[PDB]
Design a protein around this ligand. Sequence first.
Ligand SMILES: NC(=O)c1ccc[n+]([C@@H]2O[C@H](COP(=O)([O-])OP(=O)(O)OC[C@H]3O[C@@H](n4cnc5c(N)ncnc54)[C@H](OP(=O)(O)O)[C@@H]3O)[C@@H](O)[C@H]2O)c1
Ligand SMILES: CN(Cc1cnc2nc(N)[nH]c(=O)c2n1)c1ccc(C(=O)N[C@@H](CCC(=O)O)C(=O)O)cc1
Ligand SMILES: [Mn+2]
Ligand SMILES: [Mn+2]
Ligand SMILES: [Mn+2]
Ligand SMILES: [Mn+2]
Length: 159
Amino acid sequence: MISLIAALAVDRVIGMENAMPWNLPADLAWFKRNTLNKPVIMGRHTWESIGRPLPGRKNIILSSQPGTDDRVTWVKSVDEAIAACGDVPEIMVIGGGRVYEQFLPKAQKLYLTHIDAEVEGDTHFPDYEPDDWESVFSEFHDADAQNSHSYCFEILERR
Ligand SMILES: NC(=O)c1ccc[n+]([C@@H]2O[C@H](COP(=O)([O-])OP(=O)(O)OC[C@H]3O[C@@H](n4cnc5c(N)ncnc54)[C@H](OP(=O)(O)O)[C@@H]3O)[C@@H](O)[C@H]2O)c1
Ligand SMILES: CN(Cc1cnc2nc(N)[nH]c(=O)c2n1)c1ccc(C(=O)N[C@@H](CCC(=O)O)C(=O)O)cc1
Ligand SMILES: [Mn+2]
Ligand SMILES: [Mn+2]
Ligand SMILES: [Mn+2]
Ligand SMILES: [Mn+2]
């Protein structure tokens, strides 16, 4: 099973200048909770944004070019990325925009954080078709001293 996980600001913005212009520790905790002990697939730009291997996860990087770090696994196509995960229950695709667009048709589950923040961005989550997805979990949180925007965690499953 392939899942996508992402945090989206208003208008589906997911990044700006290879970074994310919000700091929401509760959402990072959610990301860790839902990805630990699973393989994670990311594009090369997201690998450079994260800046180091994510511990406790098999890190698979998509790039057309040879890899430059043997602490992670480098693959050259979508099919190779999936195969490199082996026979696990759930593969997590962690972006960025180009990678989400290629894996969305293959995904059964979306883990989305909707952040109530107006962010100029240069990268968006794919338009997906709402009729294709059932919301199975949602949990809203007001802003607090640690998280400066309200946010909603949602899980959707392909109908
Ligand atoms: N809000 C969130 O949840 C979230 C999550 C992840 C990322 N982001 C943000 O997303 C932005 C980065 O996204 P992006 O769309 O620019 O880049 P991306 O999807 O991270 O990386 C694209 C790169 O991945 C490689 N790639 C993708 N598909 C491939 C394929 N089929 N075969 C081979 N290589 C492939 C290519 O590398 P080569 O050029 O080396 O061939 C391509 O240039 C940043 O702003 C980051 O902060 C946000
Ligand atoms: C840019 N990026 C890709 C990306 C994909 N999907 C996402 N989905 C959502 N919901 N929120 C995102 O921020 C998000 N980010 C990342 C991803 C992870 C990290 C990072 O440092 N993670 C640590 C933190 C553990 C903690 O603080 O509790 C860890 O996991 O151990 C940094 C940048
Ligand atoms: Mn092929
Ligand atoms: Mn197999
Ligand atoms: Mn806000
Ligand atoms: Mn599209």
